[model samples]
Target: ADGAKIYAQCAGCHQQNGQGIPGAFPPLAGHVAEILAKEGGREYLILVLLYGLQGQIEVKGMKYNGVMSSFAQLKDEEIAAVLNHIATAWGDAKKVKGFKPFTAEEVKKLRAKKLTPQQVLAERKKLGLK
Candidate 1:
């Protein structure tokens, strides 16, 4: 599994550069770094990938109130790979305190913890991400 290739699916909204669309899609480039800073932030992203997200949220001074589609159909390995890609693709992950690359084994464990998009939002709120 090629992470960049898999990321093609995400590029539609996040954009190839991961800058995302202002007010529509929040940029993952710099914002992902902020996420990496929070407790359970890494896992939160995993949930978002598996369950998708639907709600209003603010990131980088922009409000994004759109639905993020789930990519649960992808294999755990593929999920891990894509996650790693998103982490480093824009160079923001490097600035995180102790960022670790996602693993398929870890992803496998979380897969069993099924959740809804709304639930994922709650988890995000718990982490205090805006």
Candidate 2:
């Protein structure tokens, strides 16, 4: 799948440069690398896309309490592509130690469990991340 092309939809909120609206939508450029570094952060990222997320959260030392709609309708490959796009596009991939590209199969496995956006937020909190 063409990750950049598929990421076009996300660019609506996250922005073309991945610098989201401050205090509304958090930026993915530097923030994603931070998430990928934490335990369970990777899975939480996937879940957020699969089920959506809502509630207060902190990123890059800033607080954002917004609702992110799910992209569950996207195919597994497309989902994986988007994840990889955000993970690498901003050159933060190397910042994450032992970073592994997300696979369609990995997305499929996590899709086995359906979760609400709220539940996704819980998973985020479970990661001990803001």
Candidate 3:
């Protein structure tokens, strides 16, 4: 499956370039891999995909209070692929030590661990990403 195709859903808000909409949507680019490397940060993103997020958050010194739709119904491979694309697309994802791509099994392990938007927010806080 094509990760770009899977990313289309998010592109509506995050933008096709992954640059997002500044104050409306947090750009998916820049430091994504760093966030992925953060404690539980990787899983937190997967959680966000599995479970949609809503509320206020800061992005590039701006505030974005919107809803992130869930791609929970998508296949494990698709989600993993989509993540691989985004994390490495325009961010320093490929510069990390373990940029070895996401495996479907990895997504499967956390799939059942359903979380709410707020719960994910907590994880982001734990990861020190705002």
Candidate 4:
């Protein structure tokens, strides 16, 4: 399926341009790409998509306290494709030296973790992203 069409599920919150609703939804634009490029980016994105974002969080320097619904029902491939699409579409042009798309296998590993957003946040903080 066309990745954009599949991305409709995300559009309501993240918007077509990948700029989320500011304080309501985290911007998927540049941040999604950042998440994919960094060491824990892939895992962090997967964890958020699977379990949703709770409490306070920031994306692109904006603070968001709203809840993000999980895409746990989605297939791993679908999730990966949507993520790859978002990253490619909204990432900072100069910063994106290359495109590293996510594979179904990688998504599968993320899906298997079964961790909550709080746990993921803790891990992220430990990684010095907090």
Candidate 5:
């Protein structure tokens, strides 16, 4: 399935169970649901995937300082599929709903923003992302 295959790429860092390496990679299993429920969750995920994250980010009370490679080489459909997979497999199964997955159109719009990961982080910092 497209979702499964797409998720394979993410498995390396995010892990098969979405339990990312503690203090190294953030867990995707439970967090995706919360991120989806938040207003900018969709945009944040696409941006992070497209540009990657740097600096310190606290996930599940652990901090990760590493680079998340950009998926800019991937087609919008591929990105959308992977995101859908994460949202459903890790999210709904946990009983978290209303987490609509990303669409190709939405990815395209965010991609057009042309902001790097640093820029995104800066914006988040400005917004007071804890």
Candidate 6:
């Protein structure tokens, strides 16, 4: 429940239900898989947590307008569980599967590789994720 504890701070914008605030805060319930499916997908998830994402982006097939602040303040051990919770805890859409949890070490490894919004979007384009 420690991971769930940290997620409370995230609930302010995204939501306790993981639904987000619509156009403003992209829902996390159904957002995890697509990033994991493509190349750079796994790291993309970690990057966003380590570094905030700015500018508009698509989520659930619609252009979502908002900024997701970085969660650099949270413990790495709990980051992965928070993400995995969104993917499976709420019992969301089943169009995708094979969900995986991240490791604290894995989250730790990406701390130094922070990417700008432009760089992230560019990579997303290359992976055809956005």
Best by TM-score: 2
Taking the tens digit of each residue's C-alpha lDDT, what string does model 2 give over 1-130?
9889999866888898998999889999988988888888888888988999999999888999899898999999999999999999998788977788989998999999999999998898888887
Output the number of the lDDT-best candidate. 2
> lDDT per residue, candidate 1, 1-130, as tens digits?
8889999966899999999988888888988888878889888888889989989998987788999888999999999899899899889788987678999988888899899899999999999877
Q: Which ten residues in a row have the lowest lDDT in candidate 1?
A: 92-101
Candidate 2 — which pairs collide?
none
RMSD of each: 1.0, 0.9, 1.7, 2.1, 2.2, 2.4
Ranking by TM-score: 2, 1, 3, 5, 4, 6
lDDT of 6 by residue, 1-130 (tens): 3667677766888888787776788777767666667767777777777777776678887787566677777767777767666656565424456555667888888876767766656665666865
Kindly list the per-residue Cα lDDT of model 4 for residues 1-130, writing each as its tens digit.
Answer: 4567789756887788877786787777667656555677667776777776667666667777776677888888888777677767765533666666767887788787787767767655644553
* TM-score (C-alpha) between model 2 and the true structure: 0.96
Q: What's the distance in Å from true for residue 100, model 1?
A: 1.7
Give candidate 4 misplaced runs (Cα > 4 Å): 92-94
For residue 40, give model 6's deviation from the true position in Å: 2.2
- Winner of 3 and 5 under lDDT: 3
TM-score for predicted model 3 compared with the true structure: 0.88
Model 5 stretches astray by more than 4 angstroms:
92-97, 123-128
For each candidate, what TM-score against the reference? 0.96, 0.96, 0.88, 0.84, 0.87, 0.81
In the predicted model 5, the residue pairs found to clash are: none
Task: Evaluate all candidate structures by whole-model CA lDDT and list the values in order.
Answer: 0.88, 0.89, 0.78, 0.70, 0.74, 0.70
Estimate, for each residue in 1-130, the C-alpha lDDT of model 5 and write its tens digit: 3977878866888898888887777888888766665567678878877887787776667778887778788788888888888877765435555345568998898888887778767654554355
lDDT of 3 by residue, 1-130 (tens): 7898788765888888888776788888885766776777778778888887877777667888888777889889988989888987786586667567778987898887878877777777777767
Q: Give candidate 6's root-mean-square deviation (CA, Å).
A: 2.4
